[PDB]
Structure 1
Amino acid sequence: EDPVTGPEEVSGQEQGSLTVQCRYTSGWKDYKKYWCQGVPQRSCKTLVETDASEQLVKKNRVSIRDNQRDFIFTVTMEDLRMSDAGIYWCGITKGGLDPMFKVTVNIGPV
C-alpha cells in the first residue's frame, strides 16, 4: 500500500480539539513522523515532528505520538481556532521526496 495514509478530512470546533491518525507501512517504523501545514505541498510548514521513537512530542498546540506496533502516528490539535482550518499533511521524513498524505482540516465556530 501507500507509504502513509490518513483521513481525507477531519473536523473540529473552536476551543475544542481533533485527532488525526496517520497510517503507514511497517518498513517506515524507524523514520521520524511529522504533521505539516500549507501549500505548496513540498514547502509546507512543519508543525511537529518525532525523533523516530514512540516518545510523544508537542509544539505549541499540536502533539504527535507514533505507535510503532500498529504503525500509526497520532496527531492531536488542541485549542482549535477558525484559522486552523486548511490543508495539512501526514508525513514521513527521509532523504528525498517524503511520503505524504493530504488531510483537509475543517473548523466550526462556537
Structure 2
Amino acid sequence: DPVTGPEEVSGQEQGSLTVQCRYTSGWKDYKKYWCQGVPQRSCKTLVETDASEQLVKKNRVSIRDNQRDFIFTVTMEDLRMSDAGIYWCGITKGGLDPMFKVTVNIGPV
C-alpha cells in the first residue's frame, strides 16, 4: 500500500502529537500533506510539502519528509479540543491521491 499511518493518535490540550506516515520508495519526489475532515477528497489541506525534505509548517501543523527512510512526519502543535476528528496522510498526485485515515483524539492536561 502506498501510504500507511497510525489508525488512532491522541494528544492533550495546548500540547502536541506526532503522526508518522510511511510510504513506498516510488513516492519520494511527490508532495506530502496532512488533511482534515470528511468527505475524504474534499478535506481541508492543513499543510503540504514541496516534495523536498525541508520542514514546512502551516495551520498549527508541521511536516518533514524523510526521503532516506521514506517516511514523512506530521506534528500538530498547540492542540485544541476541536482538533479531534478525521485526518488523512496524503500524497499529491494527478487524480485520486493515495490517502490514509487517521483518527485524532484530544483531552485535557
Taking only the aligned residue pairs, the percentage that are identical comes to: 100
Shift of 1:61: 1.0
Q: Normalising by the residue count of structure 2, what TM-score does the alignment of the two structures yield?
A: 0.99
Q: Normalising by the residue count of structure 1, what TM-score does the alignment of the two structures yield?
A: 0.98
SS of residue in 2 equivalent to 1:94: coil
Cα distance in 2 for residues equivalent to 1:29 and 1:53: 9
SS of residue in 1 equivalent to 2:86: strand
Shift of 1:60: 2.7
SS of residue in 2 equivalent to 1:83: helix
SS of residue in 2 equivalent to 1:36: strand
Cα distance in 1 for residues equivalent to 2:76 and 2:5: 15
Superimposed CA distance per residue, residues 47-80 of structure 1 (whole angstroms, 9 cap, x where no aligned partner): 0000000000000310000000000000000000
Number of aligned residue pairs: 109
Superimposed CA distance per residue, residues 26-67 of structure 1 (whole angstroms, 9 cap, x where no aligned partner): 000000000000000000100000000000000031000000
Q: Could you tell me which residue of structure 2 aligns to residue 60 of structure 1?
A: 59
CA RMSD of aligned residues (A): 0.5
Structure 2 unmatched runs, 5+: none
SS of residue in 1 equivalent to 2:41: helix
Structure 1 unmatched runs, 5+: none
Shift of 1:108: 0.6
Shift of 1:109: 1.3
